[PDB]
DNA sequence: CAGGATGTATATATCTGACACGTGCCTGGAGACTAGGGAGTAATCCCCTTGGCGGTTAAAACGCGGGGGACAGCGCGTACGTGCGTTTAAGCGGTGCTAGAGCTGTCTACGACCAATTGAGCGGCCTCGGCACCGGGATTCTCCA
DNA sequence: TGGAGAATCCCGGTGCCGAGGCCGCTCAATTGGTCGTAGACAGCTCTAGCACCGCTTAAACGCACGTACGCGCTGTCCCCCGCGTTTTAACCGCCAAGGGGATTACTCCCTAGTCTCCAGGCACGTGTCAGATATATACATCCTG
């Protein structure tokens, strides 16, 4: 008797347990992280959408996501993010 | 008769309020301000508590950033106090 | 208070009005003298379309001010709505522009109306700026003046750069010589 | 002051010429089109000057003059004065050593229009021709001033009342370039307080081609005995 | 699960569903949600790691908004990525200008 | 009414202390109240526009967040 | 052989210019600027209507969503007259 | 005879004359070819043998000149605020700080 | 070195369009540094668009979109 | 001392480059019809908003002494504006060469799409410990003798 | 500079509610087929970008000169700060209606997709005009005898 409201809570919690062994996270901090993830998702997906539109393409492929990540993240963040993206796609196709 | 110099209390308050994290405007007066501003658009509006908290957070953060830049203008003009024309300068540089 | 109302044909009529008069009243006065139904009348002053409900005082309209009269046009899918902009092309751009799964029937008509109105407003301000500078061809400079001189359009277009447009003539008072 | 205290004519006076007040130059410029400013007037009958002589009007602040009739202020624009002659009051006093002085006739407010130096504007080969014919004729007074670096002015042929001046190492007036009708012109202006009676003498800053000038009779400790220019031409 | 196959903690299925139903393109490539989930995991991991470090530096084991704020503002590239972002209950950095300090 | 004076002088002084201000001119308080009135007027206007479009009678937290998002001052946590 | 059919708002901006001031022309670069302006305003209004449809879990952009987008984008009298023009257009269109 | 050099223009008069001339006109103020060489040098550090369309270099020159003009407008306002009439490096750094580019 | 190709008179002219009356001699190095940062960011984003589109030429549309991404949208090129 | 050839400013018939209008053509827009699903509307519930009340006490208002910082004048020196003359790349046009943008054709891999299934993830409730708060001493900073 | 004094920090003790985990469930995630259009790729064409070169000249450059403006100092004065005392209203807990957000049930009209058809819009010639240019032409300069 309550509408399903999805979130990123459990995944941010999994990442927190993988990076920090003994550390918890408050409700408000989890809300901030959830809104942050939805925000960055909206930014990257919007940038990939407009990038696909510009080049007269109708499909968001790995290339559009890669270029949008290089466009939005400054410097070293972009370098490590493109490394992580390529790693993930390499593992996933295998 | 032991008095602090005009300004050390300012610095201790600066360290105090920059160290803590809480809304600095009084809740109920701000809620009356919000409802009053909302009256001129639609009559008998209701507000969720979280919406008023979000407005107070955005209001405090915007004023804090404005006062920080106004302070940088004041220091730039070889002063330590802020004047209305510093706020007008800051908002002009920002683009309003 | 004497004011003038100038038509796009260049005729000026003179009205006598007060700061307490509403724009509705002024349009009524214009119908009396010129014969134009108020519903067709669109008044512009200080780069602002004037609101029927407001008073001349609200707009700081003073003695000898000139208000500009533009007539609002009452009355293919474009011809059915009395618009110049292509409703069909807007509909196609909305469907194939990846904005929503479905696009309503009234959405392209409404959007084309808003686009044609904004285009007409900026081209009117640019045309007036070009005519006041004794030129007959609209150039980027006149568009730049049209945008930066109208407060509302300036607000809408504060973060855009108009190519080969320059800036508004603005010299700070302090730069001028002393007494 | 009243140091240069029977006024003389123009044509105990100096050598004769023709009094001019218009553009009667050699051939001609300045090419700077001054457009019609939106200056508020405060002028219907002359209660206050429209483009005011010491207020904040954008034309007068940059030594630019409005043409008569095309500026929004109409004819009450006080920044039209080269085309309407709002000159000051001077006269020609005979002095046995300083020659001929422009004595002030009314007590003059500082930083205002005093007079205009108008004459014949010519180029360099005709200018050195004028120099050669005049120092072969044997004149002892030389008016070979330069409007710009290229052109030159001369007033002994067809000039006006601005001839009767000299050099003083302490200037009272000065001369500055203005533009009027796309034409570069010259105007002498005061800077200090000017009382009726004393000659209005400024810094010539001459680069004389000769070797023996007349001595600077200013008699001040700031005077080096001679005038003092820029180059030893 | 496709998440474990790609070595990610973020749900590639959920990301893919949001991409399809989010009106971004008519077609969504299979590698796109995997890549996007990877980038989200990296950004989340960086911010959480810095907030955790700051929390230990404040003798707390539970991350509160103030620690997220300190984490964001002490990373120059995150500050550039989040220059228009305001963190609720975050506060401000202890920055006192030199000219105001006693002499 | 005149309820905008509810934001009092020491609360503005507190905000300024958090902003790094050390001394405050007396006119700063009225200037800050006017600036805040303008800012809140714009944000509440956008919020009410979102609320009226959604056919709701209560301005929710999401309307305020999206309104702030429209002005490039996004807020996390609501 | 012609090169490629590329669309633009050129002729419509020219028709509007001839409707408001028949004896006035426009430079080609100015027509380009006007085309970029129309495409910009279009992209902003469509993006905001898209966000409005998304936030309210709806998959249809109707005239109401465009109207709300217009009220959000134009500051004041521009919005009031835009809503008036759009209302006129939609009314005349659906009633004929 | 001799050339008689009169007094020049006072400092600022020719400056204000330039102010009015360049605020009334619209031509580009940066030399096109040196700027194009600057663009190609900056682009060199990302991809070798990059080519540019003339319209791209022109759009970059317009954007660059508009950004610098707006920055100098803001710098002039902050400079005039500080009771000076001469902009200094501190003024531009303050402008960029308040704008959020730093 | 080519950043010095944006010569000092040109920088003066740029300030002249901005309304600046007097310019310190130290301004020019700060202005060239600012110009370098701005052009670096816009050109970097343009090159990112070209590398995505598999084209070797930076097109006008790429520059317009790159500028638009940084909130400095440019009219008059498409 | 003398005209002729020459240099110079002036008005001019003309040349150029950008803009208005007519021409063929094609592709996308308009009209017509159908299906299905999003949404519109009635109906019900129940969360959480609004309103109220009362006691606490902390913050705000208010008043006053005083100090130090804002502001204005003065004075001083140096650096920046203006200008002149020298030089050099900028600009323009003219020419040549080929890289690559742009379009097309063909094919295929890749994702839309649909049905069945099942477990991942979400709501509810339940538990215990990190933290919020408090008190007492300890250090730390400030200021006036 | 050091002792007094205020403020803040640290360190333990208690209470508490919210983080973190489990349990039941449901619908969204995953898998397997099935297909249809997007795009990858090779090839070809033709524009336009880069490279070079000569010539002209406008702007950049370097130095000289001078003034006015920046900057430091000093006096004045006044306004905001520190703080004490008084007051007011925010705040916290508790309660009571009840409005309206959210969900449900079910219908139905509006819009995607398809098919049919033709004219509106775009690329391109063709004509016309602000604005710049080579050219007849009047008056002053040198130019040799
Ligand atoms: Zn004037
Ligand atoms: Zn005038
Ligand atoms: Zn002397």
Author numbering:
A (entry chain H): 27 to 120
B (entry chain A): 38 to 133
C (entry chain C): -71 to 3, 16 to 119
D (entry chain S): 80 to 84, 88 to 93, 101 to 117, 121 to 325
E (entry chain G): 16 to 118
F (entry chain B): 23 to 100
G (entry chain D): 26 to 121
H (entry chain E): 33 to 134
Task: List sentences quoted exactly from the publication behind this structure.
One of the essential histone modifications, histone H3 lysine 36 methylation (H3K36me) is deposited by the Set2 methyltransferase onto the H3 tail and is conserved from yeast to humans. Set2 is recruited by phosphorylated C-terminal domain of RNA Polymerase 2 during transcription and catalyzes H3K36 methylation over gene bodies. Our structure shows that Set2 makes extensive interactions with H3 αN, H3 tail, H2A C-terminal tail, and stabilizes DNA in an unwrapped conformation.
We have used focused classification to improve the ubiquitin density, which yielded maps with no visible ubiquitin, flexible ubiquitin, and defined ubiquitin. In all maps, Set2 was in the same conformation, indicating that H3K36M mutation is the primarily stabilizing factor in our construct. Although this interaction is not well defined in the structure, our data suggest that ubiquitin helps positioning Set2 on the nucleosome. Our data show that the Set2 AWS domain interacts with the ubiquitin on H2BK120, suggesting that ubiquitin helps positioning Set2 on the nucleosome. Although H2B K120 ubiquitin increases Set2 activity, it does not increase Set2 binding to the nucleosome, suggesting that ubiquitin rather promotes positioning of the Set2 active site over the substrate.
